A paper describes a structure:
Here, we present the structural and functional elucidation of CPR-C4, a hypothetical protein from the genome of a thermophilic Candidate Phyla Radiation organism, identified through metagenomic sequencing. The function of CPR-C4 as a cysteine protease was predicted through remote structural similarity to the Homo sapiens vasohibins and subsequently confirmed experimentally with fluorescence-based activity assays. Furthermore, detailed structural and sequence alignment analysis enabled identification of a noncanonical cysteine-histidine-leucine(carbonyl) catalytic triad. In all crystal forms, the structure of CPR-C4 is a homodimer displaying a mixed αβ fold, with a central curved antiparallel β-sheet surrounded by short α-helices connected by flexible loops.
The CPR-C4 protein, including an N-terminal His6-tag, crystallized in two space groups with different crystal morphologies but similar resolution limits. Crystal form 2 diffracted to a resolution of 2.68 Å in space group I222, with one polypeptide chain per asymmetric unit, and was solved by molecular replacement with the model from crystal form 1. Surprisingly, the two Zn2+ ions were only present in crystal form 1 and were both found to interact with the same chain (chain A), in a tetrahedral geometry, as is most common for Zn2+ coordination. However, the absence of other metal cations in the zinc-free crystal structures implies this is not a promiscuous site, and the tetrahedral ligand arrangement is strongly preferable for Zn2+ binding over other transition metal cations or the sodium and potassium present in the buffers used.
Numbering used by the authors:
A (entry chain A), B (entry chain A): 1 to 38, 45 to 217
The structure:
């Protein structure tokens, strides 16, 4: 309630009217679906203004909306080899089970229903669909290597990220530097099989055109 | 070794030459990739003859090839609502971790690398990608509800399935009747969100044409 009070001090009437509607994790994901998928690392304020977001911008807005209704604003980092880019989601729980809100342009690394018994279990549900699909060089290689502990944005003064103008590279870097848990050892990595051609083709589909 | 001996008594020279090559789970999956995806429920013999298979025909051949190299021939049933069809995979383990060999025509319910710490964890990696994609009626509804214990085909005389002529509906029925574990309760089911339009479109892609 205290955290929510701090948020209300920072937000305009329009912002609060939006956040008030987004009262369930499902409603939040529905809202992110209407934002155009994509320089900089916008605040939730900027995202609501310009209605454009990459993954971490999407997750930060989700975390804000979750916090506005009394959930912890939690991020999880999905960390890849240098061949790929990391992905960030907003974690949530309902009746003891983990779910995830996700902003992505492709049919992989999507929303997760609150049915996963642990962070690990949820994270593992992404592994098989995190692969190189955009080039033939290591075509189909599975690139996920680690997941973060839930990253609680409560540790910061909300001004620092909710309404920031300053570009939040520091926040991205803090997330990347937090505790991560490896998914493989060296033996397991050697076992990995590439995704099939049908899988890479499917992953390549786009929600929003690359205009 | 005893089980393998029984298999060798039943198999032709050609059959054994094939099974001898398929010495890793990865090699087996590669082989199933060359079989055309699809009445009846053919034996591994029939599948090797006609080079055509649905999911359970694929999994039984996989289980045979696994057994020929000393693994348990294990099946896992993935059980859906009445709106969908069940799917069967062949489970395997390498260094204490579960993987799965799978025969499917679509970019979902595919192979799983041996990295999953439990049957449950592996089964849960399929949940989000098991949905209605072929009609608008309950379009995108997530239909997986339970997974079986590993089903060891060792319980039967190998003649009964490896080289059967008789159509193996009884084997399918025995699998469906084995111990299953629910994934949801009624509360969780009410939380479920439909897959997106981009997801149903991606799932609809076909490896083999529907000629």
């Amino acid at each position: 309630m205290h955290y929510k009070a701090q948020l209300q001090k920072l937000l305009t009437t329009e912002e609060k009217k939006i956040l008030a509607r987004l009262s369930t994790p499902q409603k939040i994901q529905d809202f992110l679906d209407t934002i155009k998928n994509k320089h900089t690392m916008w605040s939730p304020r900027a995202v609501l203004k310009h209605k454009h977001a990459h993954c971490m911008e999407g997750a930060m807005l989700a975390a804000l909306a979750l916090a506005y209704h009394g959930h912890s604003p939690l991020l999880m980092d999905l960390q890849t080899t240098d061949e790929d880019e990391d992905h960030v989601v907003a974690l949530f729980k309902i009746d003891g089970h983990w779910g995830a809100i996700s902003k992505t342009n492709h049919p992989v690394l999507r929303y997760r229903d609150p049915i996963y018994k642990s962070v690990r279990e949820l994270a593992m549900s992404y592994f098989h669909e995190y692969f190189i699909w955009w080039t033939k060089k290591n075509g189909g290689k599975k690139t996920l290597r680690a997941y973060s502990n839930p990253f609680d944005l409560t540790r910061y003064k909300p001004e620092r990220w909710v309404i920031a103008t300053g570009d939040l590279d520091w926040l991205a870097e803090a997330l990347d530097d937090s505790k991560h848990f490896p998914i493989l050892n060296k033996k397991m990595q050697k076992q990995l099989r590439p995704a099939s051609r049908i899988e890479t083709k499917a992953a390549s589909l786009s929600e929003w055109p690359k205009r």
